[PDB]
Design a protein around this ligand. Structure first.
Ligand SMILES: CC(=O)N1CCSc2ccccc2C1
Length: 263
């Protein structure tokens, strides 16, 4: 891929690979989330960042970007073989943090086959303590963002997610991350959590429906040595509320909604 003409967004294409697709020979949503991360990481490279996207000042202060929310809407999943073009860019949301967005297109048709957004926040790597953004860093990244609004989602991506009340309708328990689920920093990839959420979706559903939407608030990181319970309940198309929590204490690590359409 590369930066667009104006250097305020990044474009890249991906060929969907054998092991990337689900049972209907189209890309799994995990494959997608992976591709957003990947193009995101190249956008950050192309402009001289680190996958924490750190600046000089940030590295100095031990600060990091971390995802607070991740929101994906898919209209059509690409097929094994198909080429998908993904464009991505960031904007600031003042001192709250930044937003990254992606547009997914068919490289053939040029039609929008999906879109994503995400909320990133500034955090002390060591203390896990969030801080608001100083003006000095709000000067380092701004030159890589458009100043005029550009919204993938101009609203479902912004609705507030409630906490699932016991008993949950479905559940998958005793999930734990293996080494493939850890990143280059030995942190559980944010894609893993997506995978875990959807373990408590009944197979019946996965077979009759395509996933349309997924929203996901991140609350706590799952450690290598932790174990997670995945809970789901129907709130209805078909809709679900979700909760990931520590198997033992019941400490929450994620919450999220899905939306599925008949085929
Ligand atoms: C959220 C995020 O991706 N970043 C922080 C906010 S700006 C930015 C702009 C271009 C490339 C990479 C970044 C890193």
């Amino acid at each position: 891929g590369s930066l667009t003409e104006d250097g305020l967004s990044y474009k890249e294409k991906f060929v969907v690979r054998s092991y990337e697709v689900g049972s209907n020979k189209t890309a799994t949503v995990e494959t997608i989330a992976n591709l957003l991360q990947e193009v995101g990481c190249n956008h950050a490279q192309s402009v001289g960042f680190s996958g924490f996207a750190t600046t000089t000042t940030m590295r100095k202060l031990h600060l990091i970007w971390v995802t607070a929310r991740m929101h994906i809407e898919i209209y059509k999943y690409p097929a094994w073989g198909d080429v998908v073009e993904i464009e991505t860019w960031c904007q600031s949301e003042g001192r709250i943090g930044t937003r990254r967005d992606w547009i997914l297109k068919d490289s053939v048709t040029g039609e929008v086959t999906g879109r994503a957004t995400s909320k990133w926040v500034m955090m002390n790597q060591d203390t896990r303590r969030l801080q608001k953004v100083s003006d000095d860093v709000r000067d380092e990244y701004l030159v890589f963002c458009p100043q005029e609004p550009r919204l993938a989602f101009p609203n479902r991506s912004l609705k507030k997610i409630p906490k699932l009340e016991d008993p949950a309708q479905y559940s998958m328990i005793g999930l734990k991350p293996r080494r493939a689920d850890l990143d280059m920093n030995q942190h559980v990839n944010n894609v893993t959590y997506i995978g875990w959420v959807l373990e408590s979706i009944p197979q019946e559903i996965v077979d009759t429906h395509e996933l349309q939407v997924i929203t996901l608030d991140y609350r706590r990181e799952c450690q290598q040595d932790d174990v997670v319970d995945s809970l789901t309940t129907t709130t209805s198309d078909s809709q679900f509320l979700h909760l990931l929590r520590l198997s033992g204490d019941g400490q929450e690590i994620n919450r999220g909604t899905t939306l599925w359409r008949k085929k």
